[PDB]
């Protein structure tokens, strides 16, 4: 039921400044009114991230994803190495009622999309190993961080009400952990899924690098400010 479209929905690959977004709680420890220095994977400050207004993108160490969501156009993600039943494949879809996570060897069409009149982007599904159902994830800003370390898939998320027109705001907001999954995959690429009816989506992508950060914990244990040590000499 999946075929390629007529025209090419080549979204413009623009560039934009990261500013001070992409900070998450690295663990589940509670600290009150203290400055803590840590070393982990982070999105560097004031980096350039890619803006899409739907190709294959490498996974690398981790992924930071952002969406200026308007009326819930984006639907889910696909992860894998060769993107076929010859290898493993992870599918995550947030439909109208719940979120579904599947670990199987799918046979996806060239240009998947959910479509409306459930899942039909895959021609076959065999040897399914892991299944998961939970509460749905979703003029809003949706920020997600995906990491895959030692056979563990970590998803952090945050939702923000924003009023700015085009780009990311000049603000700070930590990302709370959302999901941990005990599944061993060696993902290298990922995609994006749209609910396209037969008849232009803006989002931002950035990568993660290992470095050291300084974080400030207030009285209640909420991160309010951070400093990137590998920057201009004043920060160091």
């Amino acid at each position: 039921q999946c075929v390629n479209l007529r025209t090419r929905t080549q979204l413009p690959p623009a560039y934009t400044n990261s500013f001070t977004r992409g900070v998450y709680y690295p663990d589940k420890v509670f600290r009150s009114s203290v400055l803590h220095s840590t070393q982990d994977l982070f999105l560097p400050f004031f980096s350039n991230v890619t803006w899409f207004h739907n190709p294959v993108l490498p996974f690398n160490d981790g992924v930071y994803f952002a969406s200026t969501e308007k009326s819930n156009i984006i639907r889910g993600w696909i992860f894998g190495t060769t993107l076929d039943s010859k290898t493993q494949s992870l599918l995550i879809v947030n439909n109208a009622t719940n979120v579904v996570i599947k670990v199987c060897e799918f046979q996806f069409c060239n240009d998947p999309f959910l479509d409306v009149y459930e899942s039909g982007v895959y021609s076959s599904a065999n040897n399914c190993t892991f299944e998961y159902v939970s509460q749905p994830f979703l003029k809003n800003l949706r920020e997600f961080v995906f990491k895959n370390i030692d056979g563990y898939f970590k998803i952090y998320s945050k939702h923000t009400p924003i009023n700015l027109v085009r780009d990311l705001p000049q603000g700070f907001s930590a990302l709370e952990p959302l999901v941990d999954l005990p599944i061993g995959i060696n993902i290298t690429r990922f995609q994006t899924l749209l609910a396209l009816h037969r008849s232009a989506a803006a989002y931002y992508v950035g990568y993660l690098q290992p470095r050291t950060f300084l974080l400030k914990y207030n009285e209640n244990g909420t991160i309010t400010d951070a400093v990137d040590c590998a920057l201009d000499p004043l920060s160091e």
């Binding site: 709680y25 589940k28 420890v29 509670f30 600290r31 009150s32 203290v34 190993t129 892991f130 056979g151 563990y152 709370e176 952990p177 005990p182 599944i183 061993g184 209640n220 244990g221 909420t222």
Partner: protein, 364 residues
């Protein structure tokens, strides 16, 4: 004091001898309400088991398996474990489980075992000699055997080769022992590999049907998922005890605290990596940890020549847990002092004690 000073005579003064510490009382464990039991009911209490050469396979992963109920269950005539002893099976576990269910005769029960050979063990299913796990066999003559003959069950009897480990053969190809090919019709040199069982309610012991389930455990590099429950006991308060809260092991006294954990933190620490607050997986409340008291001890003596009575001071210890009683006990900003009486007067300082007070000999 004589021991520490290595002398038989001691002059007037205060000397530090040893230390004091409060021992833990009892131990506690704490784990969540636990759930997601493995669905073993549909395996052993299944309606009907398939054929021996078409044995059913069940994959068990991401659940908790209570082995105590099956270990104590006497409904199974044969329970042979080859991997590890079943008693400790509840603790050690593996990343995934395979359950192999079929039906054999009462005389074929010993075919299913590591390092065993036979018709079932070589033509219907193969158990590797390095197999790890357990085999559970139980009589089912009242159900599987039929009065008219249980010909529904079939077993493979003829095959050119044996079975590989963890291999299921359901092929119905006409076996040809001889050199004469057959065009799909059984002949002198051609026979059907599968023979029907003839179970009866009254057929004698050893020929009755027996349902066999083999549990095999595998430990691929993926994290382990399925094994026994984590028992937890009740908790106590205001007593120096040792605890293992969800893997965090330590000793101290547990009190109630008003700190506000944000809904995803588990435990907290202040500085220098020292845990202070924890959250119990069952009640979900914030508890505070304090190291139960300790401190040095000291002896005040007026000299060996004068007398031979002394006073004992515990430094930085509240006057609540000395043991014992001795004489009147006085609480000072420096600790707790026993063996001397407090007076209202004020003289020169003989044997310094601390916080602006000191003692002397008169009684002390």
């Amino acid at each position: 004091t004589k021991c520490t000073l290595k002398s038989f005579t001691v002059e007037k003064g205060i000397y530090q001898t040893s230390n004091f510490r409060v021992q833990p009382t009892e131990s506690i464990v704490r784990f969540p309400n636990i759930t997601n039991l493995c669905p073993f009911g549909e395996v052993f209490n299944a309606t009907r088991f398939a054929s021996v050469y078409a044995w059913n396979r069940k994959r068990i992963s991401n659940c908790v398996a209570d082995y105590s109920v099956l270990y104590n269950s006497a409904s199974f005539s044969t329970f042979k474990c080859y991997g590890v002893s079943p008693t400790k099976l509840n603790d050690l576990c593996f990343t995934n489980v395979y359950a192999d269910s079929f039906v054999i005769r009462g005389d074929e029960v010993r075919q299913i075992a590591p390092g065993q050979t036979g018709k079932i063990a070589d033509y219907n299913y193969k158990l590797p000699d390095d197999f790890t796990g357990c085999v559970i066999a139980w009589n089912s003559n009242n159900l599987d055997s039929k009065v008219g003959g249980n010909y529904n069950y079939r077993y493979r009897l003829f095959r050119k080769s044996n079975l590989k480990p963890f291999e299921r053969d359901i092929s119905t190809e006409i076996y040809q022992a001889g050199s004469k090919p057959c065009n799909g019709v059984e002949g002198f040199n051609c026979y059907f590999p599968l023979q029907s069982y003839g179970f009866q309610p009254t057929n004698g012991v050893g020929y009755q049907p027996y349902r066999v389930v083999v549990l095999s455990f595998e430990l691929l590099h993926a994290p382990a998922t399925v094994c026994g429950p984590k028992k937890s006991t009740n908790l106590v308060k205001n007593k120096c005890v040792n605890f293992n809260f969800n893997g965090l092991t330590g000793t101290g006294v547990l009190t109630e605290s008003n700190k506000k954990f944000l809904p995803f933190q588990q435990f907290g620490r202040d500085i220098a990596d020292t845990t202070d607050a924890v959250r119990d997986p069952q009640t979900l409340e914030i508890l505070d940890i304090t190291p139960c008291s300790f401190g040095g001890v000291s002896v005040i003596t007026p000299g060996t020549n004068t007398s031979n009575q002394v006073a004992v001071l515990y430094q930085g210890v509240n006057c609540t847990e000395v043991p014992s009683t001795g004489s009147n006990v006085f609480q000072t900003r420096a600790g707790c002092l026993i063996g001397a009486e407090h007076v209202n007067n004020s003289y020169e300082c003989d044997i310094p004690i601390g916080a602006g007070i000191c003692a002397s000999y008169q009684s002390i």
